[PDB]
Amino acid sequence: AGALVEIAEGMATSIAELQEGFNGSTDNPWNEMGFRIDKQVIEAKSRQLKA
C-alpha cells in the first residue's frame, strides 16, 4: 500500500571518517565479515538379501 516503503542509504561521511576510535571518538566499530567453514559427514549404510 506504499505506507511502509523500503530503502538503503549510505553513511554520513563525518561518521565514516572517524570510525572506531579516530579523533577521540569511542564505541563506533566498523562492521566486519567472517567466513565460517563448517562440515558435514555421511556414513555408508549397508543392505543385503539372501536366497
Binding site: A12, S14, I15, L18, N23, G24, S25, T26, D27, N28
Partner: protein
C-alpha cells in the same frame, strides 16, 4: 529552529580517577554553529548530522558564547 542541520555530539562518560568521572553529555548543535566552534577531540564521543536535533539539549543558530562554554565543558571533572 536552525532550519539547516544539527551535528549531534554524544559523549560517553568514563572513570577518570579514583571515585571521579567525566560525565557524558548528549547535545545537539546547529550545524553552522558546529562548524564555527567545536572543541571535540579525544572526548570519547560519536557524531552524526541530522535535519532535526536528535538529542534533548539543543544549541540553535545563535548561542555561541553559551555553546562555547558548553563544548569545552565536556571536560568537566565530577565527583
Amino acid at each position: 529552529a536552525s532550519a539547516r542541520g544539527y551535528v549531534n555530539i554524544k559523549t560517553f562518560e568514563q572513570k577518570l580517577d579514583g571515585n571521579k568521572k567525566i560525565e557524558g553529555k548528549e547535545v545537539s548543535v546547529a550545524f553552522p554553529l558546529y562548524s564555527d566552534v567545536h572543541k571535540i577531540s579525544g572526548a570519547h564521543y560519536q557524531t552524526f548530522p541530522s535535519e532535526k536535533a536528535a538529542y534533548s539539549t539543543v544549541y540553535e543558530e545563535n548561542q555561541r558564547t553559551e555553546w562555547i562554554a558548553a563544548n569545552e565543558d565536556l571536560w568537566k571533572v565530577t565527583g
